[PDB]
A paper describes a structure:
The heterotrimeric RNA-dependent RNA polymerase (RdRp) of influenza virus is composed of subunits PA, PB1 and PB2. It is responsible for replication and transcription of the segmented, single-stranded viral RNA genome (vRNA) in the nucleus of infected cells. Transcription of viral mRNAs occurs through a unique “cap-snatching” mechanism. We initially screened metal-chelating compounds by CEN enzymatic assays, followed by a cellular phenotypic screen and then optimized the chemical structure to improve the pharmacokinetics and safety. This culminated in the generation of the compounds BXA and BXM that target the CEN in the PA proteins of influenza A and B viruses.
All four PA-BXA co-crystal structures exhibit clear and unambiguous electron density for the compound, which is bound in essentially the identical fashion in each structure. BXA has a butterfly like form, with one wing comprising a metal chelating polar oxazino-pyridotriazin-dione head-group and the other wing, a lipophilic, difluoro-dihydro-dibenzothiepine tail-group that makes van der Waals contacts with certain residues of the active site pocket. As expected, the head-group binds to the two divalent cations in the endonuclease active center, each metal ion having octahedral co-ordination through interactions with the protein, to the compound or water molecules, as previously described. In FluB wild-type, very similar interactions are made but with slightly different residues Thr20, Phe24, Met34, Asn37 and Ile38. The reduced size of Phe24 compared with Tyr24 allows Arg85 to change conformation and contact the compound in FluB but not FluA. Conserved Ile38 intimately packs into the V of the tail-group in identical fashion in both FluA and FluB, making van der Waals contacts via its CG1 and CD1 atoms. For the wild-type FluB endonuclease, the I38 side-chain conformation does not change upon ligand binding. In the absence of BXA, the Tm of all four endonuclease constructs is 46–50 °C. BXA binding to the endonuclease increases very significantly its thermal stability, with the Tm for the wild-type FluA or FluB endonuclease shifting to 78 or 77 °C, respectively, corresponding to ΔTm of +32 and +29 °C, respectively.
Residue numbers in the entry: -1 to 62, 72 to 192
Write the structure that this text describes.
């Protein structure tokens, strides 16, 4: 039971193809980098869990007529993603961040960096913060039901819970299949 089989059984094809495309863009081979493949898949999966469950009307009121609260920037070629990020910044009268974000939040008009860690969410928050400063909001999640967020009006309680349930579900299935070892190494 190898990582490639695991990925096929546990991720949607849209997620898998975007992850593999990203790896190919950076000249990395999914067959030779199975930990990396899983990590990219789960990160993109989280971006979509967040984007697929959060909506706005014209007033800007939240629901779980409607438009998505978030646009996913991750999982497209960087040539395209830079156009998207600059376009969204300029459209909303905000600075274009110098780093390529993961999401754009139409509610708050902020870019978001998503981080997944097998360590302490806090620690990873502060690493990304040291680099990104005030340029973007941060959403950091761990496998052990921890998280660290940079602002009040970002993800709600149910959204936090759904991200964390999914990560916990994936870790459980990896451990069941003796593949969690692969990520630790
Ligand atoms: O955008 C990302 C990125 C993130 O957004 C992130 O949260 C963590 C890590 N990232 N990196 C991802 C990535 C994304 C998700 C999970 C693990 C990895 S591991 C390094 C790596 C990435 C992509 C291709 C590749 F060949 C890599 F080696 C690169 C960092 O340089 C900018 C693009 N990018
Ligand atoms: Mn990214
Ligand atoms: Mn990220």
């Amino acid at each position: 039971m190898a990582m490639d089989t695991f990925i096929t059984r546990n991720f949607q094809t849209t997620i898998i193809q975007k992850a593999k495309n990203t790896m190919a863009e950076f000249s990395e081979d999914p067959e030779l980098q199975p930990a990396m493949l899983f990590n990219i898949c789960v990160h993109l999966e989280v971006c979509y869990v967040i984007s697929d469950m959060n909506f706005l009307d014209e007033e800007g009121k939240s629901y779980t007529n409607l438009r998505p609260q978030y646009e996913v920037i991750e999982g497209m070629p960087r040539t395209i993603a830079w156009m998207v990020q600059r376009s969204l910044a300029q459209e909303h009268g905000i600075e274009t961040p110098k780093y390529l974000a993961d999401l754009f939040d139409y509610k708050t008009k902020r870019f978001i960096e998503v981080g997944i860690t097998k360590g302490l969410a806090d620690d990873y928050f502060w690493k990304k913060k040291e680099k990104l400063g005030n340029s973007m909001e941060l959403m950091i999640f761990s496998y052990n039901q921890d998280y660290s967020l940079s602002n009040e009006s970002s993800l709600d309680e149910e959204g936090k819970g759904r991200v964390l349930s999914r990560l916990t579900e994936l870790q459980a299935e990896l451990s069941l299949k003796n593949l969690w070892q692969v990520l630790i190494g």
